[PDB]
Structure formats: C-alpha cells, structure tokens
Design a binder for this molecule. Structure first.
Ligand code: VFG
Ligand code: ZN
Length: 257
C-alpha cells in the first residue's frame, strides 16, 4: 500500500494511480514572479462561524479533523469559485525538520508544514461524486513556519497523544478552524489535484500567501505521530508531503498585486 517511504513513496504512486503523471497534478512550485495578478478574482469568502467539528483521526498518512458536511455550516465561496463548497476536513503535511514539510513551495522555498482545509462543491451532492469532477473540490492551503505559537492550534496538538497510531480516532467537538487562519486572505489559485492517492484531478487550489506561525513545541507534537498501526514497528509520521509536480499547461493566478 502507498505511503511516503523509499519503496512506496510518491515516486511509486503512478503504478497504482497512473494519473500521477497527469496534466494537472499537485502540489506545484508557486513562482511568485510568473503568477499573474488577476483583478477579476473576487475576495475569498470563508464562512466558518457555524462549523461543527466531529472527530480527529490518524489515517496512516496524516491526522485529520472531520466536520459535519450534511448542511451549509462551514462554507467556502467567492475567490475563483463558482458556487458553494462545504468544509469536510482539514489535515496537515509536515517534515522531519523545519526546512521541509510543505507540499506547495514558494519560489522553491519549503515551509515546515502545510494545512489543507478540504471543501467540496455542493452542486455534486457528496464528496465521492465531487472527486469525479474537475471543479469538485476546493482546498485552502496555508503554510506553517516555525516561530511563535498559534494559540488556535493548541487544542489540536494536545489530543494527538490519543491518536498516535494509524486507525485511532477521538471525539473532537467545538473546534473552531477560524483560529488557524492568517490575517490576510490574499491567495494564489490554479487547477490541480489531490496530493494523496487517488490523486484525482478535481481540485481548485487556493493557497494563501501569508503563513501562520506555529511553535517548535507544536510541530514537534506532529512528529511524534506514527505511520504504523499499534503493534507494528514504530515509524514516525514525518515527511508526509508530495514534492512539487510539473506545472505543464497551467497558469497560477494571484489575487493581489
Ligand atoms: C475525499 C476525501 C479527501 O479529502 N481526500 C483528499 N485527498 N488529498 C487531499 S489534499 N492533500 O490534496 O488536500 S484531500
Ligand atoms: Zn493535504
């Protein structure tokens, strides 16, 4: 089964998921000087006030906080999007050291981690149908740098000891994802894909320019998670990022000058 190791990592994924070599794969390097400012792009609308988190789960490749997406409770709209996208889950990608971990890069710079808030287009009714559509999902990507702590992240990091190994989950209610957002909603956007199998080419990517800062203690907690299930040889869940993929025939647009 796929993973991030030498024998099952991103360089191997194309054998089970041939779309890995497709025309709109993610992540990509964001070349800030080539991205074109698009004045037609609208401000992002992030409506998270009624978000209902449900569970936190170690799925063997990341940890994920899942939300009630049976109603228009926490929705993404505007920006480059047509229509309404419901928040399903957020998760992170991070490194073994602070100089790597993000999936997208900015002028080849890697951040310590990257937060993905995953939303799906309500016109397709459920996320399984949305992943089969070129505009089915919108993922909001936020870079993490190491410095000052992010207070809104602490409730997440403090329960990670309870989901150390693959398959473990816990109740995780009343978590407010607004505490993970930076000040600015300036963004880059391009058409791309899921960055884990099945690598489906269904994602409008919205990557925020402004990182959030997290503390070393916070990201050290990420690095204590396990890829393995309980009872298997301990393999730290670190470096769970796919590297930048060829941009091919795509334009990255910027919402800001
Ligand atoms: C449909 C469930 C789901 O969200 N799958 C994802 N697969 N890759 C994602 S990423 N790393 O691009 O945000 S999300
Ligand atoms: Zn992700």
């Amino acid at each position: 089964h796929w993973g991030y190791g030498k024998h099952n990592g991103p360089e191997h994924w194309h054998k089970d998921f041939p779309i890995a070599k497709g025309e709109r794969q993610s992540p990509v390097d964001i070349d800030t000087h080539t991205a074109k400012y698009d004045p037609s792009l609208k401000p992002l609308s992030v409506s998270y006030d009624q978000a209902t988190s449900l569970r936190i789960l170690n799925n063997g490749h990341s940890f994920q906080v899942t939300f009630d997406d049976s109603q228009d409770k926490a929705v993404l709209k505007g920006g480059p999007l047509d229509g309404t996208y419901r928040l399903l889950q957020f998760h992170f990608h991070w490194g073994s050291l602070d100089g790597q971990g993000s999936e997208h890069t900015v002028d080849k710079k890697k951040y310590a981690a990257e937060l993905h808030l995953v939303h799906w287009n309500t016109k397709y009714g459920d996320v399984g149908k949305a992943v089969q559509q070129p505009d089915g999902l919108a993922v909001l990507g936020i870079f993490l740098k190491v410095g000052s702590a992010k207070p809104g992240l602490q409730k997440v990091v403090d329960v990670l000891d309870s989901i150390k190994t693959e398959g473990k989950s816990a109740d995780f209610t009343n978590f407010d994802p607004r505490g993970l957002l930076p000040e600015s909603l300036d963004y880059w956007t391009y058409p791309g894909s899921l960055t884990t199998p099945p690598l489906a080419e269904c994602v409008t990517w919205i990557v925020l320019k402004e990182p959030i800062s997290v503390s070393s203690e916070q990201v050290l907690k990420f690095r204590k998670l396990n890829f393995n299930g309980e009872g298997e040889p301990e393999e730290l869940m670190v470096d769970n990022w796919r590297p930048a993929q060829p941009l091919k025939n795509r334009q990255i647009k910027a919402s800001f000058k």
